Design a protein around this ligand. Sequence first.
Ligand SMILES: CCCCCCCCCCCCCCCC(=O)O[C@H](COC(=O)CCCCCCCC[C@H](C)CCCCCCCC)COP(=O)(O)O
Ligand SMILES: CCCCCCCCCCCCCCCC(=O)O[C@H](COC(=O)CCCCCCCC[C@H](C)CCCCCCCC)COP(=O)(O)O
Ligand SMILES: C=C/C(C)=C/[C@@]1(C)SC(=O)C(CCC)=C1O
Ligand SMILES: C=C/C(C)=C/[C@@]1(C)SC(=O)C(CCC)=C1O
Ligand SMILES: [K+]
Ligand SMILES: [K+]
Lengths: 415, 414
Amino acid sequence: SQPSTANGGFPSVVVTAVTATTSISPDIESTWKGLLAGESGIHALEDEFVTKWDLAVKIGGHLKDPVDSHMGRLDMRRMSYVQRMGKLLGGQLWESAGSPEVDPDRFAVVVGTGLGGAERIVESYDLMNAGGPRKVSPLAVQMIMPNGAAAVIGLQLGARAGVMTPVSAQSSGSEAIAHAWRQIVMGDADVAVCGGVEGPIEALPIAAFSMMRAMSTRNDEPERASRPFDKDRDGFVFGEAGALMLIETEEHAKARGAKPLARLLGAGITSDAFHMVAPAADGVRAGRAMTRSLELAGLSPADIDHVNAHGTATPIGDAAEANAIRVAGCDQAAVYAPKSALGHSIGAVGALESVLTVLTLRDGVIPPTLNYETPDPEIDLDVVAGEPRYGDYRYAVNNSFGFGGHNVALAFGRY
Amino acid sequence: QPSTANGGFPSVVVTAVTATTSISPDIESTWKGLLAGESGIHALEDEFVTKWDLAVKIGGHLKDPVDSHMGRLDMRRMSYVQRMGKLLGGQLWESAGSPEVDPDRFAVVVGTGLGGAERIVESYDLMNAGGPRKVSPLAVQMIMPNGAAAVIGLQLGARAGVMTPVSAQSSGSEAIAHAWRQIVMGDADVAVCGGVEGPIEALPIAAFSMMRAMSTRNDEPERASRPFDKDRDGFVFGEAGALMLIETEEHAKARGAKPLARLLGAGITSDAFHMVAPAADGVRAGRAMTRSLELAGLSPADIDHVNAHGTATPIGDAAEANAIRVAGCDQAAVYAPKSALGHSIGAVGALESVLTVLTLRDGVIPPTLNYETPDPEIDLDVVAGEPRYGDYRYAVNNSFGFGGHNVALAFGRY
Ligand SMILES: CCCCCCCCCCCCCCCC(=O)O[C@H](COC(=O)CCCCCCCC[C@H](C)CCCCCCCC)COP(=O)(O)O
Ligand SMILES: CCCCCCCCCCCCCCCC(=O)O[C@H](COC(=O)CCCCCCCC[C@H](C)CCCCCCCC)COP(=O)(O)O
Ligand SMILES: C=C/C(C)=C/[C@@]1(C)SC(=O)C(CCC)=C1O
Ligand SMILES: C=C/C(C)=C/[C@@]1(C)SC(=O)C(CCC)=C1O
Ligand SMILES: [K+]
Ligand SMILES: [K+]
């Protein structure tokens, strides 16, 4: 008999605080109310760079409340953007958790990102080409390295039981929460800050993904552009975000008087070995990530009330994920695709969506998937649409997938 | 509580290794060269050195450049770390006898410091010159830092997870740690793991040397890298990449693979001290070593050998000596391979894990080069002068990284 959360072979792990910054709001509770009210964070892009380059994509969700409005003079000169976002969210989360005094030697941080401080690579490159090697900042390395945001949070909050950065492109944010769960259940930590951060919409990221022919170009109706699972979808839309949650053993939470929002029960990680940038059509390995999360949780597929889909609104992505949900035996779950409203934040998105999964369990409600108007027969899923779907949801799986063939599924439960 | 010794974790063995280094593309020749006291560190002849008059004019390029093995298409459609990952993954698999494994039980975990960053700057220049439609359609998949691990997973058919842990100079060891976790948690029976890294270039040298941590002993390049020596003056770049194949002992026995060593346990901690200096007290670094022992089921008295991260910076080696004391491992024989091979950043912990395996397999530790004046603050048994033979049974490989990351791996003789 394998250990599971249900059989007590793993310790119970609970989510005790959440924080996120999104295109709708810097306040996760206001993001959540806005989603439930059918709001979209997607807008016409007004940036100069759009007109400068005449970009084919002219839509996206910038953060409602820009990170750098909270940054001091020295932060702007000593950290890359994902580090600044990490420091902002790290401090917000800790305050939301009641600023607890925890044992630093039992406290881990696991934060994913898609790339790291890449703007400082191009900065350094230009500085050196113009003025030679002594023009490169002595801080360049530490601003650039992709583990930089996780390290800044570890330093800020004092985590001494490991600081890790898993990178798996668009599944990085969920993968980080999986590895944090593992670190606790293996006995390496009792409490962990985890999730994901990502850079803002800029011209070069738009250019590179646009050349994969991946992106929606419904520029005339920005809030209608992102249409996961809909027959008429035409690709993904960027929406900025960063998100963190605090997880800890149930015993640890109870000893300090924390009130859990949900339980994090198990995590599955698999890979397709199919193609570098398309998911396997059959959804079999993706489905097996979901199944592995259920095995570690001790659940059956019939237990799962809700799936928070990766749902990017590409034609081949959504079709693969529908197959994966069928493989896992989860296709009678109520499905939400939050990128319909919040867009795609790449290395942060799995973390944001994990936070939304937690709030669905806490509050008994799934927001409507925006723009879901014409069901697609290849996609026979129960996609929540039109108005929120209320229920006493007991268990839910959050899915995230990434270029490279990475599949991550996280199983959460109502507390 | 489970340990390897108590049977609570399955037994995991190392069954193949590959590496490319500044001494040789052939790990067995690297090893022979190390034992004979060879250095891979040379004067750098690159035009970029004189173009920028770099303060640092030494390092070790790969003896056999990755791209001498690469087709025209790969040169345009993979980043350098992807090309290195493809070359090494193919070599490792052939060395392992090209086994037919269950893909759904096979994982890949490969760390790197940065990823396909030359494609970032190239995409930036191409767009600045010609607009957004000049950026390659393959740019994202070449740039993404999971790119090398993903290339190897697709090449070899791994469907039980492809992971890229990033922890700067400890990434290559951290990859092997997480591969070990993936197998003992039951998610895989076999894994390819290790680390790749880019080559020495002008901008990397400028960025590290502006931190003031690099040796500039340009007069005597083979003498420059002096871990634990009293006169050390900073680290030296030495290119590498390394992968190993690990699998359950049951899996290896079933296919007739002869183990090279056992991978017994892994410890990961962090300092929360400074972004680019290790904690002077060595406490959390020593606890990484202690955790690898706890998971192995070993005590510090059992350890014969420590393969030190040993970068040759003044404050780095002092902190590590403290760490080895905190862990109770300071009676062990110490080797600092960066003395001969220099520092390969994201790859280096993987390379040094392969060297730890070979020490255990062959009963010998190479001499730490350039170790001439003991430093009283260090007070370690640094193997030097000639290789040291012995019946080594248990060894710890240490790796640390910017951000305060500490990774220790506990290996045993098979
Ligand atoms: C939801 C969006 C997600 C996008 C994800 C992309 C991930 C990349 C990380 C984003 C980059 C951070 C930028 C933050 C600072 C900032 O904004 O810099 C502006 C001006 O522009 C720049 O410096 C642009 C510099 C670009 C840096 C290189 C980016 C390369 C992108 C690749 C070519 C394509 C994407 C690779 C993704 C790989 C991983 C995921 C699969 C300062 O403005 P000012 O204050 O000077 O007026
Ligand atoms: C042991 C060394 C370790 C170094 C580690 C540094 C990280 C390496 C990053 C990958 C480097 C890949 C380079 C391969 C391409 C190549 O070689 O192309 C040259 C031409 O130059 C270039 O393109 C240089 C391109 C610059 C790339 C950006 C590098 C940014 C470096 C950062 C500012 C500093 C390092 C940050 C490290 C953070 C992570 C670890 C803490 C031949 O051109 P040709 O023969 O075709 O004419
Ligand atoms: C191996 C490839 C995969 C999983 C591709 C996916 C489904 S992941 C992702 O977020 C998107 C939209 C583009 C950012 C894909 O096209
Ligand atoms: C937190 C900082 C740490 C651990 C710094 C170390 C000791 S790790 C490393 O390889 C080097 C040499 C620079 C490549 C350090 O200076
Ligand atoms: K999701
Ligand atoms: K080492």
